[PDB]
Write a protein that binds this ligand. Structure first.
Ligand SMILES: Nc1nc2c(c(=O)[nH]1)N[C@@H](/C(S)=C(/S)[C@H](O)COP(=O)(O)OP(=O)(O)OC[C@H]1O[C@@H](n3cnc4c(=O)[nH]c(N)nc43)[C@H](O)[C@@H]1O)C=N2
Ligand SMILES: Nc1nc2c(c(=O)[nH]1)N[C@H]1C(S)=C(S)[C@@H](COP(=O)(O)OP(=O)(O)OC[C@H]3O[C@@H](n4cnc5c(=O)[nH]c(N)nc54)[C@H](O)[C@@H]3O)O[C@H]1N2
Ligand code: SF4
Ligand code: SF4
Ligand code: SF4
Ligand code: SF4
Ligand code: F3S
Ligand SMILES: O=S([O-])[O-]
Ligand SMILES: O=S([O-])[O-]
Ligand SMILES: [Mo]
Ligand code: NA
Ligand SMILES: [Zn+2]
Lengths: 329, 894
């Protein structure tokens, strides 16, 4: 499809995400307040382990298998969650009796299994996984679309669903293995994360970066050797893409969690193992996780000894402009 | 041209991110964020908010920016959503039914003014009261109703203690209202203990400093019964039994004293641990016991350099050469003393030993240093092995935590609701302060005992008082709200009086004037103004309140942006301008900067700002006072003839403060911490405070409290003039807490689950509970959590309805089963609105109001009643309930 000139690149530090959902809210309040968009969270944050959003998206199918395009399933509306609705007016102002219940009867929702994770007390474990469109170097959605409605912007590598060209074929929904295009049933068009390109065009960080309260998000062009995203991905090499085996070459990367307490043994004493299982992280990021954690732990140990660590300083991000394209607007 | 192929169509999204006006906004809620925001309008409609990210950074440490949170970025939903009060509303059905008629402002305010004049005329001005909490959140809106009350004689309320946010044990120890480092200082610590604190959910915009501190090489410990969200990032997790933390703390103190890991110099200088205690009466040896005309309020330590007893300088009986004014947040103004005053110098107070001394009356008595008594009681009762049995934390763990805590410099404790909302949290906090005193980190960057709860600290507090109480706080009626609620809601605390004679202590504290009782002469409260706080929904003893207190009130007035549960149950509901339609300041203890909001658009529908509402009300009161031939009256309590015919002028200083901005500027002008700053400056960018409370505010350095005592050696405003761990008052002896020690939780509720009610990331108290987007990122309604180990034998499945109850009441809520929850307790995110997805009651249905006798002590040096300085905590974490599956509705999952 011809490489982009520059590739906007994101880094998500799982050591720092507090699962506050501020980025989920910021994104929705900017881009998905429209007709038919209520069930859509272009940006979402899910508890891992969990079912995610839509539930069981990680076995939905899609992506590439030995370079052949895969056609996965279309998640049914209940897997996204029917957005709950409420009749506040009836009870608060109109004298109607009875609680302001959610409709429908709650059974599913995008953050249904928040903080449940896995493992039995006292070794229950979970962390937070923010997700979005990965603006892949090999976007399966883009190849899938029989109408060429989806394109990757030459100037910044941002992938966009052209809303005039889209005829609702839903091959993209089928083929994105991250389940990040959402079919808008009102307009008969797919909708998905736009990389905040209007913000990026004015030198302002995407809202899910600029408004990241935990200070866990990095953004920049990966060709910029003084960017934190270059440093974390290319230099120190501690930032991995989510499910590399999907074959789409995401351009959103994750620093895996190295903060966290130890497994607790039956006598009450610490193991050396972390409560977050390595096998879980390997499931999300593959076999390189072990060495990344080793680097991270090693570098943090220098900091504990009062030694320098440039890597730790990068993650810490004492100034937000060292993490991102300017967040001021 | 220079356009890419699809750039024309892309104008569709560029249009979504556009505005024609950008104003400054804030969220005037009780979250402690005080987060700078911009508000974005297009064609007169607010589109959205975004953090302005413009607090000035400090060198070498992470900036505060962006702050914000998930509620804040949907704050505009309360402008346009289904909850908004548009017009004044008068009740037509029974309270709570939501049956209304729209009224004009005139009819609304006249109904109110008529009632207020009658109530003063027919009963007493103290039968009227205004509840409006946390002045720091919105000081102008806070001052509106408090000034109204000030000039008609209505009484005010307390909030800090009523909520259980008041660090009662800190006031007992240090003689201050409270103080704490700003959160940037967490980055200066090598070792942080999160003690009943869940900052991942409950300090959301500040939480980054913790994980950043750790990446910069700090270690963090979480202490919490459940595996809470904050805990997934800490290096070590300690999970004691609920309310047994005190035993953990005392065992840590034992290990530290025994293995001698303490800072003896600091102890000798900054605490009362060298002060001498009479073996016979177990009181402090005092000057009066030794010398004719010797002071009740001066003491002795044993100076090991001269082998002679010496009177320590700085205690209550020692007056400075020139007194200062009283300071609201101090027991007494010890700033009036000179620097160096309590410096140890060549003194060497003994911490161990027994000594004999000659009494005035010829008798010879044996005395011991507090530390000697403390130490012998810890070796006997507070070993790791014994605290292990109580807490369920291994002795090895307790010991290793003690040693780490005392070895890492600096270390700090961060405590919160998990440790502050218990019956005995006062003695628990004294124990945490004992741990800090022992390690010497108090008043150091990255050190100390730092508490965080509500938005209680308005650094410009003299400017606030200037506007709210212009004739002085000493000419203002205050109840203490925990007592007020306990008594007027006729609460049943279930504590049998042969265990703790709550009634006697309470009665004796009122009749001897240690604590207030409003109204006086046993009259009923009659008129209740509630605004800026959802008093009914959050009130402890809610079921008693609804059944007993509520029907005493002839008129209940709620002023609000939205229909919360208090307003739902009110007689008159007045529409208040949204945060983005008003002008106000906004500050907090978490950071040292002044935030503000300004109008983006004019007040919507018929709403008015709070300042304007009490201004307009003042006029109708003038009109009514004349109609009723009752325009002035005497108020013998203050020797104050009140002039109701001049109320408006009184509200505004003869028109000077008739506008919101002049009132906001008035606060800024009348406080040392703010004088110089103008509204226009604040409108542009948040400004740092010019000074603070108990330490210097230094350029480029995070604030950390108490340095004026620790560094400058001014006396602590306590009875002893030190950090005081020995409180030798009769009530403290009665409760077994003359010294810090473990007090086991109240088990008056004879039910088997401990009831936990922590604060959720998904709301700010009851505000945003009902926000549709927030509910959509949960499961559509309130939640109570249980361990699978308790739920399975009750046949309770995830998201089943469960029923929780005790003698106080019952609540039915959908359950969330979470493996991280500790068996034996259930956790219900606190105070969902009564009208939400609950089949009956709410969290407060199962909570009484309870009063610990030590919180009623008001005749012991720094222990005296002052509103929000000292008084009964409204604790609730001792509550116990039973739980069963609710079988009236058992929906299937899919
Ligand atoms: N079992 C149990 N019980 C507990 C607790 C617990 O942990 N467990 N916690 C406590 C604690 S610590 C606190 S601080 C209280 O929940 C605070 O409640 P509060 O009424 O102040 O906030 P809230 O947000 O609910 O109400 C604020 C009201 O003011 C409205 N509002 C907000 N801004 C304004 C304004 O500018 N003007 C006016 N006139 N109104 C405004 C707001 O809509 C809400 O009704 C309490 N009980
Ligand atoms: N998002 C959000 N943040 C808030 C608020 C809000 O409403 N929403 N409210 C603000 C205010 S006013 C308050 S007072 C604070 C309260 O917030 P916090 O100070 O954090 O206190 P809690 O949420 O009650 O509980 C904190 C943790 O302590 C645990 N803990 C509970 N009981 C015990 C115990 O007995 N011992 C020990 N060691 N730990 C225990 C709880 O399970 C919980 O995990 O949050 C403030 N921050
Ligand atoms: S805002 Fe930043 S921290 Fe909060 S959830 Fe999104 S990514 Fe995690
Ligand atoms: S994530 Fe899915 S939608 Fe976004 S680019 Fe990669 S394939 Fe297309
Ligand atoms: S980049 Fe922009 S559009 Fe994509 S998720 Fe973040 S906020 Fe939403
Ligand atoms: S609500 Fe409180 S914490 Fe959330 S953004 Fe507004 S001020 Fe900050
Ligand atoms: S496949 Fe193409 S036509 Fe639309 S629904 Fe997806 S972009
Ligand atoms: O204000 S909007 O997001 O309905
Ligand atoms: O139990 S059901 O409604 O998830
Ligand atoms: Mo609070
Ligand atoms: Na809403
Ligand atoms: Zn909205």
């Amino acid at each position: 499809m011809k490489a982009p000139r520059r590739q906007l690149t994101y880094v998500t530090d799982l050591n720092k995400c507090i699962g506050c959902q501020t980025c989920t809210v910021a994104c929705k309040k900017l881009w998905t307040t429209g007709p038919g968009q209520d069930f859509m969270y272009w940006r979402n944050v899910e508890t891992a382990p969990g079912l995610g959003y839509p539930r069981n998206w990680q076995t939905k199918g899609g992506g590439y298998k030995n370079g052949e395009l895969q056609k996965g399933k279309i998640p049914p509306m209940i897997d996204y969650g029917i957005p709950f609705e409420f009749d506040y007016a009836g009870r608060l102002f109109e004298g109607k009796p009875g609680r302001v219940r959610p409709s429908p009867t709650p059974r599913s929702a995008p953050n249904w299994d928040e903080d449940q994770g896995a493992g039995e007390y006292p070794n229950n474990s979970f962390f937070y996984l923010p997700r979005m469109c990965n603006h892949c170097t090999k976007p399966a959605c883009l190849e899938a679309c029989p109408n060429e409605a989806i394109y990757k912007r030459e100037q910044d590598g941002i992938v966009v669903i052209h809303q005039d060209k889209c005829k609702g074929a839903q091959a993209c929904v089928q083929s994105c293995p991250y389940a990040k295009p959402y079919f808008n049933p009102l307009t008969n068009k797919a909708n998905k994360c736009i990389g905040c390109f209007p913000r990026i065009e004015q030198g302002v960080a995407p809202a899910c970066v600029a408004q990241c309260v935990g200070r866990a998000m990095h953004v920049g062009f990966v060709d910029d050797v003084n960017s934190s995203v270059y440093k974390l991905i290319k230099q120190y090499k501690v930032a991995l893409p989510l499910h590399p085996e999907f074959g789409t070459e995401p351009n959103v990367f994750y620093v895996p969690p190295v903060l966290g307490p130890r497994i607790e043994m039956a006598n009450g004493e610490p193991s050396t193992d972390p409560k977050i299982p390595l096998a879980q992280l390997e499931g999300l990021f593959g076999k390189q996780v072990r060495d990344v954690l080793a680097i991270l732990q090693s570098e943090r140990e220098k900091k504990m000894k009062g030694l320098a660590s440039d890597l730790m300083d990068v993650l810490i991000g004492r100034r937000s402009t060292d993490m991102m394209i300017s967040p001021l607007t | 041209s220079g356009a890419f192929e699809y750039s024309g169509w892309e104008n569709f999204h560029r249009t979504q991110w556009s505005w024609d006006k950008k104003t400054r906004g804030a969220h005037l809620v009780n979250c402690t964020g005080a987060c700078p925001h911009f508000v974005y309008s297009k064609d007169g409609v607010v589109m959205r908010e975004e953090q302005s990210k413009d607090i000035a950074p400090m060198p070498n440490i992470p900036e505060y920016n962006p702050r914000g949170c998930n509620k804040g970025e949907c704050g505009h939903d309360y402008m346009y959503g289904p909850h908004r009060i548009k017009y004044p509303l008068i009740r037509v059905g029974e309270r709570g039914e939501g049956k209304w008629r729209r009224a004009t402002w005139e009819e609304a305010l006249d109904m109110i003014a008529d009632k207020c004049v009658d109530t003063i005329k027919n009963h007493a001005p103290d039968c009227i009261s205004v509840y409006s909490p946390v002045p720091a959140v919105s000081p102008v809106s806070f001052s509106a109703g408090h000034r109204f009350a000030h000039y008609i004689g209505a009484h005010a309320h307390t909030f800090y203690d009523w909520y259980g946010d008041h660090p009662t044990g800190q006031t007992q120890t240090c003689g201050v209202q409270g103080d704490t480092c700003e959160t940037a200082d967490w980055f200066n610590s090598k070792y942080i203990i999160l003690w009943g604190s869940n900052p991942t959910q409950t300090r959301i915009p500040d939480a980054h400093f913790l994980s950043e501190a750790q990446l910069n090489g700090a270690k963090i410990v979480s202490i919490s019964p459940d595996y809470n969200s904050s805990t997934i990032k800490v290096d070590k997790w300690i999970h004691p039994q609920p309310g047994t933390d005190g035993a953990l703390a005392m065992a840590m103190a034992h290990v530290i004293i025994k293995e001698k890991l303490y800072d003896a110099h600091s102890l000798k200088e900054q605490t009362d641990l060298s002060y001498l205690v009479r073996s016979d009466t177990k009181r402090f040896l005092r000057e009066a016991d030794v010398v004719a005309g010797g002071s009740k309020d001066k003491f002795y330590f044993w100076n090991a350099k001269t082998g002679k007893p010496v009177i320590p300088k700085g205690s209550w009986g020692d007056q400075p050469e020139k007194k200062g004014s009283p300071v609201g947040f101090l027991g007494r103004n010890t700033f009036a003393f000179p620097k160096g005053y309590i410096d140890l110098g060549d003194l060497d107070p003994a911490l161990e030993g027994k000594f004999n001394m000659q009494l005035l009356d010829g008798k010879t008595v044996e005395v011991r240093p507090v530390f000697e008594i403390l130490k012998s009681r810890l070796m006997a009762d507070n070993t790791p092995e014994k605290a292990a049995k109580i807490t369920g934390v291994t002795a090895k763990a307790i010991t290793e935590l003690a040693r780490e805590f005392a070895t890492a410099k600096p270390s700090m404790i961060i405590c919160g609701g998990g440790t502050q909302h218990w019956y005995y949290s006062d003695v628990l906090l004294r124990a945490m302060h004992l741990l800090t005193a022992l390690t010497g980190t108090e008043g150091t960057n990255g050190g100390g005992m730092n508490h965080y709860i509500g938005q209680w600290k308005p650094a410009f507090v003299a400017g606030l008082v200037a506007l709210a109480f212009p004739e002085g706080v000493n000419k203002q009626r205050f109840c203490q709200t925990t007592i007020w609620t306990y008594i007027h809601a006729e609460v049943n605390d279930e504590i049998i009086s042969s265990d703790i004679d709550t009634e006697k202590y309470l009665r004796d504290s009122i009749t001897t004037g240690q604590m207030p009782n409003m109204p006086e002469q046993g009259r009923d409260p009659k008129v209740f103004f509630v605004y800026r706080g959802n008093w009914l929904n959050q009130a402890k003893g809610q079921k008693y309140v609804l059944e007993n207190l509520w029907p005493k009130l002839e008129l209940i007035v709620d002023i609000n942006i939205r229909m919360d549960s208090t307003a739902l149950y009110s007689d008159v509901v007045l529409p208040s301008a949204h945060w983005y339609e008003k002008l106000d300041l906004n500050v907090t203890s978490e950071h040292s900067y002044i935030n503000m909001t300004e109008p983006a658009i004019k007040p919507m529908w018929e709403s008015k700002t709070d300042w304007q509402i009490f201004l307009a009300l003042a006029k109708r009161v003038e009109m009514a006072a004349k109609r009723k031939k009752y325009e002035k009256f005497n108020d013998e309590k203050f020797k104050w003839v009140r002039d109701l015919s001049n109320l408006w002028n009184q509200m505004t200083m003869d028109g000077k403060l008739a506008e919101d901005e002049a009132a906001a500027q008035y606060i800024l002008d009348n406080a040392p911490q703010s004088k110089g700053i103008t509204i226009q400056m604040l409108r542009e960018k948040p400004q740092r405070f010019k000074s603070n409370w108990t330490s210097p505010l230094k350029e480029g350095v995070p604030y950390t409290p108490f340095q004026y005592f620790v560094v400058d050696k001014k006396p602590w405003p306590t009875l002893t003039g030190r950090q005081q761990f020995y409180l030798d008052h009769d009530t403290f002896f009665d409760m077994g807490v003359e010294l810090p020690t473990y007090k086991a939780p109240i088990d008056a509720d004879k039910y088997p689950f401990r009831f936990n009610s922590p604060h959720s990331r998904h709301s700010v108290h009851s505000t945003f509970k009902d926000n549709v987007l927030m509910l959509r990122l949960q499961r559509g309604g309130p939640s109570i959590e249980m361990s699978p180990l308790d739920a399975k034998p009750l046949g309770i499945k995830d998201n089943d309805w469960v029923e929780a109850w005790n003698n106080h009441g019952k609540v039915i809520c959908r359950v969330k089963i979470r493996n991280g929850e500790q068996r034996g307790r259930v956790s219900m995110w606190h105070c969902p609105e009564l009208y939400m997805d609950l089949l009956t009651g709410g969290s407060q249905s199962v909570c009484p109001v309870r009063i610990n006798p030590t919180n009623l002590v008001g005749n012991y040096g720094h222990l005296f009643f002052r509103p929000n300085y000292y008084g009964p905590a409204g604790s609730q974490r001792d509550v116990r309930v039973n739980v069963k599956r609710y079988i009236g509705a058992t929906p299937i999952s899919f």
